[PDB]
Amino acid sequence: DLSCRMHTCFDVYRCGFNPKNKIKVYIYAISREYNELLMAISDSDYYTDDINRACLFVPSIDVLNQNTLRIKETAQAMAQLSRWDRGTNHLLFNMLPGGPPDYNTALDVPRDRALLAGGGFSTWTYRQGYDVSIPVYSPLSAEVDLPEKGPGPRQYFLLSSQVGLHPEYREDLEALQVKHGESVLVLDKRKRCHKHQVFDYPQVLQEATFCVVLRGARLGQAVLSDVLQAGCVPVVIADSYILPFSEVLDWKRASVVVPEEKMSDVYSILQSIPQRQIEEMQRQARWFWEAYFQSIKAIALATLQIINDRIYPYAAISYEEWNDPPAVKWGSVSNPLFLPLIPPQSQGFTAIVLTYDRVESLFRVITEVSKVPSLSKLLVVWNNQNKNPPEDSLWPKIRVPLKVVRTAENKLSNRFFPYDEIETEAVLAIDDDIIMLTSDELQFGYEVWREFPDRLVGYPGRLHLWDHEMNKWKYESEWTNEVSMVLTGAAFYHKYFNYLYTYKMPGDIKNWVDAHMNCEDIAMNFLVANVTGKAVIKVTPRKKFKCPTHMVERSECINKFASVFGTMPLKVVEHRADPVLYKDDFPEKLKSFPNIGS
Amino acid sequence: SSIYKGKKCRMESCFDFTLCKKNGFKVYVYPQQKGEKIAESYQNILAAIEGSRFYTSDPSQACLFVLSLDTLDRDQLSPQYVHNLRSKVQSLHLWNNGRNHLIFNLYSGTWPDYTEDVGFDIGQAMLAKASISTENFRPNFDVSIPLFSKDHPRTGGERGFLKFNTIPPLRKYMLVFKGKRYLTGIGSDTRNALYHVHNGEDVVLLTTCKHGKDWQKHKDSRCDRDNTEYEKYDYREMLHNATFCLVPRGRRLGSFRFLEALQAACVPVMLSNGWELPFSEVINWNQAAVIGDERLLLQIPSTIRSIHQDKILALRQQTQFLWEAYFSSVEKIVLTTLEIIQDRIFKHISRNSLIWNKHPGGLFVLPQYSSYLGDFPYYYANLGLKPPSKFTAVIHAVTPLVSQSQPVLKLLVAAAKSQYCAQIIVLWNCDKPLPAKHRWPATAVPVVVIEGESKVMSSRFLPYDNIITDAVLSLDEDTVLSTTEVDFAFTVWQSFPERIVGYPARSHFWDNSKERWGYTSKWTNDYSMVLTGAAIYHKYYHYLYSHYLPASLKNMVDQLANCEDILMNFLVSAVTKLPPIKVTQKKQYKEPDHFAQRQSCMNTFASWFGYMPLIHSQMRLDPVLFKDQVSILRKKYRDIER
């Protein structure tokens, strides 16, 4: 029944909510492909033994092949399953939905309400949020392991390798071949022959840039998996057909679809695709093959994941987790603070000051930070467990709240804890020996942070360089025309970065920095560049921060951190954000920040 | 096509593709008869289509027809319902059984058993209905539009509500609701069970039974208690103090509460089962809203508490983006509908899901330019791609080449010496003929000269096929630069490709003494416009200026021979929602009617956009060690100070 959607057909009384947002699948106690599918489902986390606690029922009946189905007997068995209950939450897998009399592009069994996962779906036989479109599994994907050919130019531009196409398709393809020649390599009747010349059928597909996929019957051909494996960008010229896993996969980035009527102009369409897009489409096709088309296990897992995402929409995996290749995933960013919002100056920032035996200079920090107009709250992290904070009469009188937090352990990570006492978005993490920053400089730093609230706006200027002689990264601190790090001696950053340091920093970087009591700013910059994807922004020309075996440790820190991340997430820029009208022949009163100079 | 020419209509059967058959995809609106009452909402929809770039006056050229009859309200009891519509639309000569017709509808159904009674026989026309159930929605044919009132802005924007993004992303409450409950009829089942989940601490579900005028007759014991608590809390103050805003089903599947939930930054938890969410064909709603089944109403607080902080942060930001991009005003909605229709004609020219569900959005990303995501300045981070290292220089010449000392010559060689330049294009828009080939000084990069067919200021922003780099260094004839300045600007652009990187910063402001926008060029402590006279920007903005903007604005720009840079900055700040980047301390990059024309242009552009998309910023990107007391042998960009 086509009028069968989740909100009415599906019975959500069976899987309401679980701490792990994974639906449960039960399998009743036969082609080898279906045996492999059942084995793949059984070894997954979705498998459960209790019938009562299950939400999806997958019968142990072969429905992939319809040429030898005996539809009446299969329907009788489906009814006889003794738990059919009008097919409320049952799932059926299919790959050849067609009939010798006529091909309906769907399974011909009654299946009054059951979920269907079939290879061939038209937009008329498809229920949007109910059915799932699965690839037509090709045994050639695993039978022959084609070498992983790198993306690049190919001998042929357009190619078509299908047997028994309709005569109109053959006529159009031959017309294209005679119109262009030496590029459109149309092939005819596991080996292909053009004209007395033989190509290896799995491997000829590796010799072409674009590959033609047509519809002869069942609306979905097994050649799509082979085309994806060979890496060529598939061209589907089926008029009304939805590509497998179109719900979660972005086929616009991995294929070209042209209508059957507009087939004679396919070459002009394909020539409009730039070569870079061709390489990206080839990479996406290979990724789709190795992640979803490779084996019956991958298809079954993808189907179960899609259905689980339908059942638990709030816990569905991301688009990038679906259609980004692992190389792209390592190179991707997925910035968490992406919304282009400019926080108002009515709010302010919270200053976290980490002090350790600098009481005389600490009050100087308090009276220097407190002079800025936009300070909201001052927070001091007393990290010394042997000396108590001075008397509350000794603390200076300031316009904003000041509170002191005792730390049970001596760690450099105590600066980066997400304290609930911080109510604002911005954090000014400043060391206890930072006095040279004027009020206007701090205000300018905050103002620049408002325009760039997803980065690390620091005042220290650092760099890292590559030592060719030693084949290792080298920490740099000399005044150079390149910045890769801004130290947390004076850093504006989102409190989400504190949360990330405390609960998401990869490896034992937090533990290692705590152990060695060094290199916390480097780790923070590394995390910010890894999660945000864009380099830090250094502000002001000021470089000196002290009015009155460590460096090799910093180099070792950089090397270890690069080892942990597996790459250098840091980026090199030459951005010294300055106030506009800086050092101009303008009156000082009208300037926004006429107190920056070093 | 004969079998499925009915309720099963699709775009490949009940839609004639041959009528567009070109890059020109036009929409036609029937004339109004000056004898029928028209609701303000349908009039706003019509005005938004007519003011669009899809609007044409020729029924032969267009491939999309819009009725002038009000089909928004089909409730027979509604005051805006129009009687005798079936015969009135069947008598139209261009109807053709409604083959390429878009019908806008917001309400349908009478008092008992509200259904999709559109009134007349639509035939083959795809209806952009508001509250569409899932089983009555044609997937690749119909467009599910939001339900909006008559007060929805025509062209402006509410600009969201989330002005702070603070962690943890939680607020005072967790679920909120305040709306009427119906004691008789259909559609109040999900609203009569909210007292079960209501707890009063973080799950506050308020209802009132006062509906119509006879609500007192059917009231029960519970209504007295519930109505007392109704006045305790304010609805507007309640949506702004909840991480999640419950959006249940009223009489119909949709409601005004969805858009208010999106605007208030609270992630909507929709309890309307079988609701095709607005623009669901292009928008992934798992990223901006929580879809809760009506049957599992008691488990809603548990499933809500199970949501993690990162998921909530993403959901809030995504719902704010969706509001600001697609649902903010009526023009946004109708343009989104038209573009969703357009993407279904040429499949190889379409917006991938990464375009709709990410900044800047599908409105500002036109696949007719390129379907490759790397050809846009917004998706570099989402891929593993770095900005291209080469740029193309376009020089706008309006004066004849009479002497070898003219600034256009020294500027052409200056850009060539840069290690990043790929080529130079000299747009010769002068009355005199083209100069001799030997007059061009020898350069490492090729130089291509194009004589403009139409000598208008909008020709400098055309998408020329001679530009082989994604970056464009746009210079005027009187632009004075050094190679170091170009190198620095391009390097700074390499970190911010989606913006405009240039020297001459100009600002805008509001003049209360005249109640209008004002253009400022004096040295101010802040800027929001850097002119295109010397600026680096992605070449997709050329296509955007050429196509996206209306013909009226570009024609006015051509007529006054001004305001091209202002309009470009308007478009860039609108697409990016970010301020432009000004680099270095360059205050003058050159050497009363101009200012008035610029200010009138600014007001006109603000009127067309519906708001001011320009955003202030008081920072500039200067080189490290600029005017710093270091030995001059260590700096890289020495000549910038000179």
Ligand SMILES: CC(=O)N[C@@H]1[C@@H](O)[C@H](O[C@@H]2O[C@H](C(=O)O)[C@@H](O[C@H]3O[C@H](CO)[C@@H](O[C@@H]4O[C@H](C(=O)O)[C@@H](O)[C@H](O)[C@H]4O)[C@H](O)[C@H]3NC(C)=O)[C@H](O)[C@H]2O)[C@@H](CO)O[C@@H]1O
């Ligand atoms: C042309 C001319 O006259 N130039 C003069 C400058 O050269 C001079 O600056 C001097 O430059 C030295 C330099 O190598 O950059 C600098 O050495 C140190 O500079 C910093 C001083 O604090 C050190 O930075 C520290 O590094 C730590 C780290 O994490 O690695 C941080 O934790 C500290 O917070 C940070 O202070 C830096 O490491 C030192 N350099 C090296 C190679 O170790 C000199 O101090 C400095 O005098 C200025 C000074 O007036 O005058 C002219 O401009």
Ligand SMILES: *[C@@H]1O[C@H](CO)[C@@H](O[C@@H]2O[C@H](CO)[C@@H](O[C@@H]3O[C@H](CO)[C@@H](O)[C@H](O)[C@@H]3O)[C@H](O)[C@H]2NC(C)=O)[C@H](O)[C@H]1NC(C)=O
């Ligand atoms: C952000 O940090 C993460 C780690 O927290 C980085 O992910 C890691 O990236 C490296 C570099 O590609 C991956 O190394 C590769 O590993 C595979 C085997 O897994 C190996 O075959 C390759 O030769 C290469 O060494 C590493 O696996 C990956 N880690 C994980 C868990 O995926 C990420 O790249 C960083 N992002 C940026 C922009 O720096």
Ligand SMILES: O=c1ccn([C@@H]2O[C@H](COP(=O)(O)OP(=O)(O)O)[C@@H](O)[C@H]2O)c(=O)[nH]1
């Ligand atoms: O055991 C310690 C020692 C120092 N610090 C703090 O770490 C920062 C860096 O110390 P500083 O640069 O003053 O001297 P260094 O130890 O880095 O040579 C200062 O804010 C100290 O208060 C700390 O948290 N724990």
Ligand SMILES: O=c1ccn([C@@H]2O[C@H](COP(=O)(O)OP(=O)(O)O)[C@@H](O)[C@H]2O)c(=O)[nH]1
């Ligand atoms: O206290 C309230 C209740 C509702 N509404 C508005 O009423 C509309 C939907 O609420 P209502 O209960 O009136 O309609 P229903 O939800 O029953 O369809 C939305 O625009 C709400 O913003 C409001 O402004 N205040």
Ligand SMILES: *[C@@H]1O[C@H](CO)[C@@H](O)[C@H](O)[C@H]1NC(C)=O
């Ligand atoms: C809702 O938030 C506003 C802040 O904008 C606050 O003034 C109001 O008191 C809050 N509502 C309640 C019921 O506390």
Ligand SMILES: [Mn+2]
């Ligand atoms: Mn120190």
